[PDB]
Amino acid sequence: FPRVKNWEVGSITYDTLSAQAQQDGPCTPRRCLGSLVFPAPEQLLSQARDFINQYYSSIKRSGSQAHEQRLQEVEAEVAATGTYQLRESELVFGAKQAWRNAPRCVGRIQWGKLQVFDARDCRSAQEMFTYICNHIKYATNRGNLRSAITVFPQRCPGRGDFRIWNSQLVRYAGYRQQDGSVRGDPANVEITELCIQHGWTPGNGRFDVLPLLLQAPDEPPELFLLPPELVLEVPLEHPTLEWFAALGLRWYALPAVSNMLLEIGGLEFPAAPFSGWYMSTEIGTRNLCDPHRYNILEDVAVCMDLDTRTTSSLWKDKAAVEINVAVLHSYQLAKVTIVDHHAATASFMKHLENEQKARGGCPADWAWIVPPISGSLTPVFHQEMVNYFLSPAFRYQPDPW
Amino acid sequence: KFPRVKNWEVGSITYDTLSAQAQQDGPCTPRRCLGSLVFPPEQLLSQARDFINQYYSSIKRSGSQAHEQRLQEVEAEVAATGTYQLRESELVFGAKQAWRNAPRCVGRIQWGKLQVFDARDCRSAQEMFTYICNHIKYATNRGNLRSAITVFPQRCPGRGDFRIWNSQLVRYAGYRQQDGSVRGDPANVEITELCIQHGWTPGNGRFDVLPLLLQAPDEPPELFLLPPELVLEVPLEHPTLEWFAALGLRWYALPAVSNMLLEIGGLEFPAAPFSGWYMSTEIGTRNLCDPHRYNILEDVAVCMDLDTRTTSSLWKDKAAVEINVAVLHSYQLAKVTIVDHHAATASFMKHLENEQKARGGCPADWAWIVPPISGSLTPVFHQEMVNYFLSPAFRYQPDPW
Numbered sequence: 001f002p003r004v005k006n007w008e009v010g011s012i013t014y015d016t017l018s019a020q021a022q023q024d025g026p027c028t029p030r031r032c033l034g035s036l037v038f039p040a041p042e043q044l045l046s047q048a049r050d051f052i053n054q055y056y057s058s059i060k061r062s063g064s065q066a067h068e069q070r071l072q073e074v075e076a077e078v079a080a081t082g083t084y085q086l087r088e089s090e091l092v093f094g095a096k097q098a099w100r101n102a103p104r105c106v107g108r109i110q111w112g113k114l115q116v117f118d119a120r121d122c123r124s125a126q127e128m129f130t131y132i133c134n135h136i137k138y139a140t141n142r143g144n145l146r147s148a149i150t151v152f153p154q155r156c157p158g159r160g161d162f163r164i165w166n167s168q169l170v171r172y173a174g175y176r177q178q179d180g181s182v183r184g185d186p187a188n189v190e191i192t193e194l195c196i197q198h199g200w201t202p203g204n205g206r207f208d209v210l211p212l213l214l215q216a217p218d219e220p221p222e223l224f225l226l227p228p229e230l231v232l233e234v235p236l237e238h239p240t241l242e243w244f245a246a247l248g249l250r251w252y253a254l255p256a257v258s259n260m261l262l263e264i265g266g267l268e269f270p271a272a273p274f275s276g277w278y279m280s281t282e283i284g285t286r287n288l289c290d291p292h293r294y295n296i297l298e299d300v301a302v303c304m305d306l307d308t309r310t311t312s313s314l315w316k317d318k319a320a321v322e323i324n325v326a327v328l329h330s331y332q333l334a335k336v337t338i339v340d341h342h343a344a345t346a347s348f349m350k351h352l353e354n355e356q357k358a359r360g361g362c363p364a365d366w367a368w369i370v371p372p373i374s375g376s377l378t379p380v381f382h383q384e385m386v387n388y389f390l391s392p393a394f395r396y397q398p399d400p401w
Numbered sequence: 402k403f404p405r406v407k408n409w410e411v412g413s414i415t416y417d418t419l420s421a422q423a424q425q426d427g428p429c430t431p432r433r434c435l436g437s438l439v440f441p442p443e444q445l446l447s448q449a450r451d452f453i454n455q456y457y458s459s460i461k462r463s464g465s466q467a468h469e470q471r472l473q474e475v476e477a478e479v480a481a482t483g484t485y486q487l488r489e490s491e492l493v494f495g496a497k498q499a500w501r502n503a504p505r506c507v508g509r510i511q512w513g514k515l516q517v518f519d520a521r522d523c524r525s526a527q528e529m530f531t532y533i534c535n536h537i538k539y540a541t542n543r544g545n546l547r548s549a550i551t552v553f554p555q556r557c558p559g560r561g562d563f564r565i566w567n568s569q570l571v572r573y574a575g576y577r578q579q580d581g582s583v584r585g586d587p588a589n590v591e592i593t594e595l596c597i598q599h600g601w602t603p604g605n606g607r608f609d610v611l612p613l614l615l616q617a618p619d620e621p622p623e624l625f626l627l628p629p630e631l632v633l634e635v636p637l638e639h640p641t642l643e644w645f646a647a648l649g650l651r652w653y654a655l656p657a658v659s660n661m662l663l664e665i666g667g668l669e670f671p672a673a674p675f676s677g678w679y680m681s682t683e684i685g686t687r688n689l690c691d692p693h694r695y696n697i698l699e700d701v702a703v704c705m706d707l708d709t710r711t712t713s714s715l716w717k718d719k720a721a722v723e724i725n726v727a728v729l730h731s732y733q734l735a736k737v738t739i740v741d742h743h744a745a746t747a748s749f750m751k752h753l754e755n756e757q758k759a760r761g762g763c764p765a766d767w768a769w770i771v772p773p774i775s776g777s778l779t780p781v782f783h784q785e786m787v788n789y790f791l792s793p794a795f796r797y798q799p800d801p802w
């Protein structure tokens with residue numbers, strides 16, 4: 001059992017939960033690949049059996065009458081149909097556990113507070129869009145954001161997958177330019193090209209909200225525009241740098257990841273978009289300051305009158321701090337839920353403590369948990385962490401194109 | 402079997418073929434990644450043979466006269482004595498390789514430029530002290546710092562070992578109180594209590610340079626007051642925050658790690674202090690702002706009149722940046738070599754590209770290469786890395802008590 005130290009306090013714990021790590025990661029004793037971004041009925045049965053065991057533990061009915069009945073039921077159904085169906089309460093529990101198990105998620109203190117929308121009866125891409133609009137409406141909640149997941153029908157033999165082609169429900173277009181630059185978000189060049197290639201009439205702004213490409217089984221993807229008033233956005237201003245508003249920067253309220261696969265008890269939900277609220281560094285630091293994203297850092301430092309001809313002035317660090325201040329100020333002014341990296345990492349420390357008592361450990365990916373600015377100012381920097389894969393889980397999956 | 406390694410800022414891909422050589426198993430398994438953990442008789446000939454082959458390939462002299470001859474001499478030496486002595490040039494080449502192979506070292510672009518003082522004829526703590534003193538003065542060089550290592554005698558069976566008890570050659574005292582808490586550096590409370598217990602008269606201050614505890618084989622250590630004119634220190638001031646000087650902060654010029662064990666070709670040097678120059682975040686972020694170190698962050702933020710009542714003002718981030726500015730400015734004013742984390746990480750990316758061409762990869766520990774402030778503002782953040790152990794190497798070792 002790995003010994004885990006907190007270097008700020010001196011605390012020492014043992015991650016006994018990692019011993020139950022089901023699937024295998026990318027590291028070996030020869031080489032750690034922890035920094036890489038992207039590292040049969042009998043086996044369906046053992047995964048299902050384990051998840052059902054998990055579910056009946058959570059309802060304090062382990063080894064009980066209903067527990068055996070469910071195990072027998074699922075085996076009977078896998079024997080008869082090659083698969084099985086989750087009960088509604090199992091789906092809710094499994095979606096929460098998948099969030100709880102997600103090693104790169106700093107917001108997991110919230111894991112038990114998740115609204116699960118059961119769209120497993122969804123029939124078409126048109127119904128899928130309605131479900132998604134309802135998800136967006138509920139989760140946004142006029143700025144008082146609520147964590148939610150909508151679960152579309154599971155992968156099943158004989159039919160194609162439901163897929164949302166967009167990586168998030170809200171994404172800004174990225175248009176390749178006349179010279180070769182990107183106008184808008186360069187992370188979204190590919191999905192933007194697909195939307196146009198699928199009949200979308202592009203804009204030419206820097207913050208054009210993309211349409212959804214929604215794929216019903218064995219169907220080409222279908223284009224759906226989001227009603228402008230469903231997509232809550234936050235114009236970005238800075239509390240003391242009045243010129244900052246003239247940058248015309250915006251970001252959207254709702255982080256809704258839509259391209260990940262939800263795996264529960266061996267069943268796979270390739271379309272299961274989930275959303276919470278932002279941590280300000282995702283926007284201020286990564287989306288706005290990554291060189292390959294909006295890349296505003298130098299322009300902001302220039303406007304700040306910082307000396308950008310030498311690195312030792314720390315103009316990059318000063319400008320990024322003020323971009324993050326602007327993000328926090330702007331979301332608070334708009335009354336849109338947002339958490340700064342200090343509050344978020346402090347709450348994650350409480351999550352690790354809760355999880356140590358609850359399960360004997362917590363899967364955590366240090367390099368993703370530590371914020372991209374001011375890392376060692378947050379308590380998670382000084383916390384050793386053990387990264388491993390538990391199921392139920394959210395998994396990356398190939399793009400459908 | 403050759404890890405794909407992507408740089409996410411540029412999109413470029415390489416393969417780490419060098420990882421195929423990793424001798425010492427790291428702490429990770431397919432089951433769980435332990436990458437964030439700080440600290441996770443003829444065997445001698447295999448490592449000697451290997452290291453000798455490394456030497457002769459590096460000088461384009463593999464499979465030619467002097468190579469074979471040297472292979473026999475170590476073979477005969479170990480047969481006749483159970484160990485061997487490194488040639489001068491091999492001690493040199495081995496020290497540079499252990500530095501080159503140090504996965505957590507961001508300054509490895511400098512690995513070819515290293516001054517190696519051969520102290521293998523040393524005998525007694527008095528001899529150590531003048532060797533250490535020669536090193537310190539050469540390395541300090543009136544503030545024009547020069548990377549150096551002094552290699553005290555290797556380890557042999559049946560006889561005690563040379564050890565420096567201090568973790569660094571320059572450490573500040575840590576004094577407990579009428580209330581447990583510490584004045585000075587809390588990192589060094591332990592060695593501070595050993596020095597006092599071995600006869601040193603404790604000062605009262607927050608920046609008393611500790612005396613050295615030097616240990617000749619099979620002897621209790623001997624205290625040594627470092628010549629005060631040989632410990633170059635930098636008073637910390639800020640270029641525009643006039644009151645920053647009044648905080649009385651200082652740091653020393655020379656980072657000289659003196660508790661690590663140098664291993665070359667099977668031989669072990671438990672006393673081999675190496676030094677370079679500081680990266681500014683080490684002082685300004687970790688040493689001065691860690692909660693368990695000097696923990697000055699709130700004191701500077703009070704002086705900057707920052708709103709410390711709400712974490713979302715990012716007052717921690719602002720105070721941290723100014724402390725780092727103060728470090729860089731002070732060292733540059735004192736004309737003491739220092740490198741900021743932007744220059745240091747840009748140089749490390751150049752080092753990665755060089756090493757890719759030279760050796761087919763580079764052991765790099767992402768969590769330590771990425772600086773503790775403004776992580777994603779530096780290029781190494783966006784560089785995937787592979788971590789593994791190559792020989793020769795610097796290894797951690799137990800405290801000699």
Ligand code: HEM
Nearest residue numbers: 099102103104105106107110147274275276277278279394
């Ligand atoms: C409630 C507020 C939430 C916050 C503040 C938050 C925070 C974060 C952040 C900052 C990341 C890293 C993103 C990046 O840097 O690209 C992340 C990843 C992630 N989050 Fe959360 N999140 C929240 C809610 C949720 C919810 C509701 C779910 C699912 C039910 C979820 C599941 C995930 C997953 C799966 C990842 C990727 C994890 C991995 O690959 O291991 N999060 N989260």
Ligand code: HEM
Nearest residue numbers: 500503504505506507508511548675676677678679680795
């Ligand atoms: C010349 C300027 C140098 C700079 C700026 C530099 C920078 C650094 C930094 C920032 C660390 C991280 C330590 C920490 O944060 O606790 C480090 C670690 C380390 N440095 Fe360097 N360093 C330099 C030279 C050297 C030299 C000359 C040697 C040895 C000959 C060396 C060997 C090491 C080793 C062995 C580690 C720990 C590696 C590990 O445990 O994997 N460095 N260095």
Ligand SMILES: CNCc1cc(-c2cc(C)cc(N)n2)cc(C(F)(F)F)c1
Nearest residue numbers: 104255256257274275276277278279282
């Ligand atoms: C930072 N933008 C990209 C990104 C954001 C998020 C994310 C997701 C949620 C629910 C909240 C939040 N605050 N963030 C999750 C991921 C991924 F891919 F890891 F799941 C990626």
Ligand SMILES: CNCc1cc(-c2cc(C)cc(N)n2)cc(C(F)(F)F)c1
Nearest residue numbers: 656657658675676677678679680683687
């Ligand atoms: C700031 N932490 C103290 C610390 C500093 C350094 C270090 C060493 C050298 C030669 C240069 C530098 N700039 N730093 C190396 C280590 C260790 F032990 F990891 F090797 C620890």
Ligand SMILES: C[C@H](O)[C@H](O)[C@H]1CNc2nc(N)[nH]c(=O)c2N1
Nearest residue numbers: 035036037367368782783784785
């Ligand atoms: C290459 C490196 O692993 C990559 O840039 C990672 C590092 N840590 C991260 N952490 C978070 N939260 N989000 C990210 O996108 C990344 N990117």
Ligand SMILES: C[C@H](O)[C@H](O)[C@H]1CNc2nc(N)[nH]c(=O)c2N1
Nearest residue numbers: 381382383384437438439768769
């Ligand atoms: C727990 C965590 O691994 C630990 O705090 C590490 C993280 N990265 C680091 N990186 C550097 N350069 N120095 C350090 O001391 C640490 N500490």
Ligand SMILES: [Cl-]
Nearest residue numbers: 255282283287
């Ligand atoms: Cl995002």
Ligand SMILES: [Cl-]
Nearest residue numbers: 656683684688
């Ligand atoms: Cl240090």
Ligand SMILES: [Gd+3]
Nearest residue numbers: 239240241242
């Ligand atoms: Gd003004």
Ligand SMILES: [Gd+3]
Nearest residue numbers: 246247299303
């Ligand atoms: Gd302009």
Ligand SMILES: [Gd+3]
Nearest residue numbers: 644703704706
């Ligand atoms: Gd006043």
Ligand SMILES: [Zn+2]
Nearest residue numbers: 027032429434
């Ligand atoms: Zn690992």
